[PDB]
Amino acid sequence: NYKKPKLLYCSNGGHFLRILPDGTVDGTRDRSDQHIQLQLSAESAGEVYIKGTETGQYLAMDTEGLLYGSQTPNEECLFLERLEENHYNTYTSKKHAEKNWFVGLKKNGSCKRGPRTHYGQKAILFLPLPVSSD
Template sequence: MGAWFTHLILQLAAILGSSLVTPTPLVRTDSGAQLERDWGQQVRLKHLYMEGNSRHLQINPDGHIDSSHAQNFYTLLEIKAVERGQVVIRGVNTDQYLCMDTEGNIFGSTTYREDDCNFNEEQLETFYNVYHSPRHKKVLSLSLEKRPYIPNRELPPLSMFLPRENELPMATYSRRSSERETNDTDPFGMRSGQQASPKLSRSSRG
């Protein structure tokens, strides 16, 4: 009787003990930064607000890149993740890709080429983003000073960007988007454009 009672007590203790154990939390296999920065979305609609001059990056119809204090349809950008941590940026109103040449100069072009129009996107401790070309090794900047991207090194002026939510009415964007996006898996039409497009050069911009 004593042995049976002792065995019963041990079983009850084991059951009670297991119920008090905190379950092991599920571990995410993907990057928390990726989720915070919406890399999971196919296309993000943002305005890139620059640290240092309180303006937004702007892609003009002639391919010239400058900035504007207020949000407008030239500062409204589609940012598409082409792979983890790498994006393509295109102006909504001009259909021009944001590109970089070998010297680090940025310009808009209706022709997409991976070498010139893909950018690595990284978030700084200040929550601003920095974009740099994996091909040309330069930081995307609106200043005349061009520098290679070196982690934890000083960045050139006007090279830190805060993606801001769009505050413009969306009717125009929705109409333009539905007219040109015929393939949901390739909304920028980049694959077909890359096959047919010549190499970007100063003479072929725009």
């Protein structure tokens, strides 16, 4: 299990985080979706980038709290990872950390924008899962 892709499974409705070619970020319940394979890479300890391998885009959060796919890994692409007691993780926008804006998905699969997210919500809980070698 060395350097293989990962999925991020959201507790809220069981959606996998999805980064679409047009830069849309949402969730899908379809675990065989073509746009859910991710590479999580660390910067400093507890800082991560989340890259959609099928498009080459990095997960980013804009100044309004909306998730989008960025072709370039810039300041808006860094997230602070925390490991909750329930074994799911949360991801906080580093650039907007003072606002406590999380990566989040609604039960309908759409992005729950930064200001609509809230600590303790199922919307913000993501479990990293493997993708098989082949």
